Ligand binder design. Sequence first.
Ligand code: ZN
Ligand code: ZN
Ligand code: ZN
Ligand code: ZN
Lengths: 63, 1482
Amino acid sequence: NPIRDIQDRLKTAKFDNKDDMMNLASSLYKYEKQLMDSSEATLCQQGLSNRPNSFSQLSQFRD
Amino acid sequence: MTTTMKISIEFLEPFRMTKWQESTRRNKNNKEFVRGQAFARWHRNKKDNTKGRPYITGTLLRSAVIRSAENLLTLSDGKISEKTCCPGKFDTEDKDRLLQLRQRSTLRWTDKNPCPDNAETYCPFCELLGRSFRIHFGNLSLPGKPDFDGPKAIGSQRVLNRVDFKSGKAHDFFKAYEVDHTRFPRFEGEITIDNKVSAEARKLLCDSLKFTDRLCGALCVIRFDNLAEKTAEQIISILDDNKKTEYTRLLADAIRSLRRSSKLVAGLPKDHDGKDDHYLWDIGVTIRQILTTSADTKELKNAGKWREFCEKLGEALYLKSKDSRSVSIGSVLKETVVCGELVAKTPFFFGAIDEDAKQTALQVLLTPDNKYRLPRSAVRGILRRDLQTYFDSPCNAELGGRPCMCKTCRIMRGITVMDARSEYNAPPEIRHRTRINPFTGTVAEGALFNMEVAPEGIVFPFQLRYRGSEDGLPDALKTVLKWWAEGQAFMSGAASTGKGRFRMENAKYETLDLSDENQRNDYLKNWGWRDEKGLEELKKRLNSGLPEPGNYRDPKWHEINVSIEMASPFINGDPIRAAVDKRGTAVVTFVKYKAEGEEAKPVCAYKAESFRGVIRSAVARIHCECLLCQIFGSEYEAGKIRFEDLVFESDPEPVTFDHVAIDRFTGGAADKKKFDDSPLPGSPARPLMLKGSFWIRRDVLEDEEYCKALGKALADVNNGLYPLGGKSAIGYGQVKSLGIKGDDKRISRLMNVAVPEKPKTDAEVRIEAEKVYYPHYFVEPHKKVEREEKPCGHQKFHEGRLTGKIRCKLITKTPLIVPDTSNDDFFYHKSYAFFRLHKQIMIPGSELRGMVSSVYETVTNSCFRIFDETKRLSWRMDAQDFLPGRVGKHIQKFSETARVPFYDKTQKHFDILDEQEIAGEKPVRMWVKRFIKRLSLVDPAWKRRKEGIATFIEQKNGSYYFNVVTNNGCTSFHLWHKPDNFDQEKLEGIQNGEKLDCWVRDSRYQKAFQEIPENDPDGWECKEGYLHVVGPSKVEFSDKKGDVINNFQGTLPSVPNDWKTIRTNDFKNRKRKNEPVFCCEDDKGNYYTMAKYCETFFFDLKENEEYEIPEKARIKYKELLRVYNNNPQAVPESVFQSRVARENVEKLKSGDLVYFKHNEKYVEDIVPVRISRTVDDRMIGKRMSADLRPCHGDWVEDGDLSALNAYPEKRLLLRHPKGLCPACRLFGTGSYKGRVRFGFASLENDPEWLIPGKNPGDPFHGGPVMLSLLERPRPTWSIPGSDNKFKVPGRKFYVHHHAWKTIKDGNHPTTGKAIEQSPNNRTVEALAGGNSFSFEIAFENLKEWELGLLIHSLQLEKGLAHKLGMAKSMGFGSVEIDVESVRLRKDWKQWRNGNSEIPNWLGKGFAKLKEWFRDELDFIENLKKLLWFPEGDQAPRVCYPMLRKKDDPNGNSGYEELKDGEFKKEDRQKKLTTPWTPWASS
RNA sequence: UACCCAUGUCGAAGACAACAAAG
RNA sequence: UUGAUGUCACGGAACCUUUGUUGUCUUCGACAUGGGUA
Ligand SMILES: [Zn+2]
Ligand SMILES: [Zn+2]
Ligand SMILES: [Zn+2]
Ligand SMILES: [Zn+2]
């Protein structure tokens, strides 16, 4: 469940710490890879809990 | 002394050129330099600038001449004239200086030793060699030695690869520049011959010059004697100024599709109603007008110029959207010439990518003049591959070294083919291709690409020459040419999808014996008949046919013919063609082109890639060296099966079907979700025929396992399990029969209890004849929606899952209206007929799918699949917390207001104030009176009861003007007072100065005038302020005279053009001379009554009290302006509209005057007028539980979410954390294909009509019935305010009744009066009750409870019914579903009958409903009550209330009185969420 | 600064969301 | 714009893998406007 992984590292991510950001980027890239190569992990039809906070953290990561 | 002979080389083919290399790179070690020593060379005028020109060295020509001389001497026993020639010398001691060494054998004729290293006399071959500069070859250059910008100005670079014979895949490649002979045919040079050279050497040189047929990679004869950028920028600017960037990639491709013809611009689609408001071509000048003047340009009149213009425009828009040895062969040499044609029997693909064009992923090779090219390299490679197939031995040679001596290489060393081009220059077609994720069933990430395809029917000239010592062609060559003459010439790439199959036709051949002196001399004289004139002369003497191979080996591919027969519509999507087509639809089916002569004929077809993918999916579920990898190929090995395009036997005309998505809350059309499609019509009565063929390798066809695999897959395809094409969920692409011919029956061999009745319902609804019930009610959902993390995958038939079919019958219990919306004038007023497909009455599978989905989403508490989550609601206020203000970070507060008469005749203010003072930008100076004093002369017989002395002054027209002193002489004021009974009777004579004690009262009178009225000069301040004019906007317009407009005296004036010239004509209340009103007439708009004569004036500006405006207030203001400027009910005349609507105010600006309500710090609501609208703080999707909103939905929060565009995790912000609801797991969502398909419902028997038809002879057409107005559902009624107490009540269901009878009589279902025809109401063809339709629902991978609950949602219970079609609020469209067949799939061959196991499924479904909702299944009972069909002799009265009671003859309360009575906002949700709750008792 | 309402007209949605080439 | 007694480059298929597809009832009732009197 890559999406649960992304959720965990998002809730534990602090943007000051470079290691946490690198791990979050690794999780995001792993999910991207699962989407690219058709697999069972593409059957993950869920989203993210706490949409405002998750959106804020993702936007900060992209900034 | 020496003689110079001038030499000219004429090229008959595109020749090859190298790239310029640094002067240090010109060495033996450079691999690229030595690889290109047999090509033309590029000369740079200056080292660092690419400007230069081509040339051919004299060394290359000398080497070719030496080789030709060796051949000629071998054919003549080494005797040129009388003299004989030694074998020559080819041994140098210091090899290192030589750039290249001879890796080929030297032809031997005579055995004596070479000429002495220092001899007085040398043989002619040595003089030609240069042993005795006796002969100097110069360089060959273009005539006049022109210059070009670079090598790309004369040619293009192409990739030439080397493939593996076994795998069929390339493993390396190289590049070279190819220069066309049409543009650069001739090169010129000179040969300098010394006088001492023998005449025999001269004759040998001339013979070698005439015998040299190839140079630089081509056949040669040697003789010796800005609008597009401007248009793109304009279109882009129009796109950005109108905020329509998303369409760029749709506009890039569609305009590219215009490269075929300039006439296509005039045939661009228009909007519905036929006007120029297309959502693409009229975005602007419009883009259509940009492309229409571009087609009238003299420059772009030519087809080529238009094509280049369109290609450049498309590329620009796409880019914006993105942003030694001595061996004797003997004297026997023969040359066989074979001439004919290669005709494309399938579309072909010779891959060649241009790096200056990035719009297309895969591109075909063309000539500079846009003709199709059959390259020599591809023909040679295919010949080599076929020779290797004949010999069954791969050639394990490596580049470099001595020549390979296998039979394939020996035959290939004598082979010459000629490069060919076509006479057909039309643009290639573009095909879309995708890849499907097996698990979800939708496309994979990034799997969407384009491919350029060359049309079929193109004829290529073909010429082959074989030179060899044999009597004629080799046996292998004869066999290969026989294969090519039978259509087994697979010459191009993309062979697995049926590309590049050619047939050789009109083949003629002739063998010339070059060992004969006379024939050899004739061959030399005519230059071997290589040029066009010599080629024609040779063709006149060519023998027809081809030699027959002595040892013939069978071809490796066999053709299997496919016949598909489909009883359903079919579409293969082509969105781009739909954008340039006059039909104006969202999608059209795939169409390909066939080249007939130089013209292109369009034919409808089924793409080969789609069939290949469907078949591959079929084989992969009833089961790298896997069977799939050995049958269908992989990224490592080429496939053994080649699918072709399937074309329809009889040409079908496309038909247009309209679809709309229904909101689950309002029961009406969802926003922006109305669409159409153009499939190919198919039906059980007249099916679609698809004829085609594929090719299978024989070795696969003789293998048992592969044939068994294909047979099981094709058996499942024949059994309807795998639909063809798109949109199978709505009944498209059902394969009724598939048949395979030509396989020797090796694959074709494998292809080979009543239903329990419905339970009677326990639902009880008691109907009383006195009451009147509402047409619809809401089912309040349960608080819990079960979701699952992982839905089932489409990758295999899972164990314990039921896959099969349900045959069902639908019965009409009330009249049904399913309209055919292609024609709006079947019987302006719109008329529609019943939906038909080829004169057969049908119901589309989308209608039934939506109807059954609405009930399945309710039986299993699920998400509201269709919901306009982003809708913001507004409410009209009624006639205290709205304070004046002026804008702008903050709005200031004004202390007080006053009415300034503007449209009356008492003042002349319109003259005395400038435009800016009227607009409100500049402060004004006006006197304000707050209270007006009114006096009674006598004590009443009034809290103030002021008593004071009054002195009369004058009396006229009844009124008395006098001055009054009161407050013990403190306050003196003048006024006019009308004669009052019991008070003015005291004073009857005019003494002009009489004293009288009087009582003065004070009345509120808030008025402001620029100049003090001359009647009353006392009691006025001089406060500044701002004048807010909205305009005369309180207007009560109507088409019939009321009371005020009827009481007008005189002619009604016309409505003036200016809104400043309005002046009050009449008074509503004439006794008191108040309520001023302006009355006017204008044509069909009829009567306008303006009851507003005072504007507003805000004074006592308090700057300190300024309040912040958050973005919420601004977006609410924007919504208010949008609903103001997009009002269908707006007054026809703009002079009676407010400034925010008259001048189309799109945003608030600094200095605007408003009424606002605020908290301690921020503003909460802003309105432009006194009585206005109020917008909701939340979007409607926030008025329901998050478990009820769609699983995959919209952004209802306060975030742009466009910042995370171009990032994938954005999809995770629109999906539910817990997964998919039961309805989304069955019917599917955008990211997940559903497990159910609903087919079209055909009518079993003859139709029964509601209204008898006009023609008694035609029982297949029915009479028309006219319906009352169908108007939008209003969420404002269900949700009557912004309070959190108001929620979305639930799913809306319409009740069953018989109100359709009154409409059939022609009467309004509420008033009982006649339905008069209007431009907005509709006329429909309807069927009556008792009609039976039969349809079919296919399911795969269903759990037991899903089948049980789907069966329940279909059949429900006896006493329950479904609602389908239009006018459901008027009683039409009650239907019932009874399941007749459930067939289940156990094996690919065995299908069991499942009518027996229906009970258990149902029970298990209910068992699931118990663990989900434990003893709280109350929404089921409400749904049952709403689905309740009224019993016989029990006829409820169900209708909508009118606007007012005065409009309803029956005396039932209207909407206004109901709003404050039975349907007050407090109990409205409980009365509307309770099924069968009345609103009138009668 | 307190009350009071008054008038009866009118169509809407017309495609949206995703994939835009990877190996 | 070459050197020369030694060029099989017509010595080399831009080839191989990928479903324009997934999701959607041609549906439907109370709304619109801003003031007026004291
Ligand atoms: Zn010699
Ligand atoms: Zn070989
Ligand atoms: Zn495999
Ligand atoms: Zn859902």
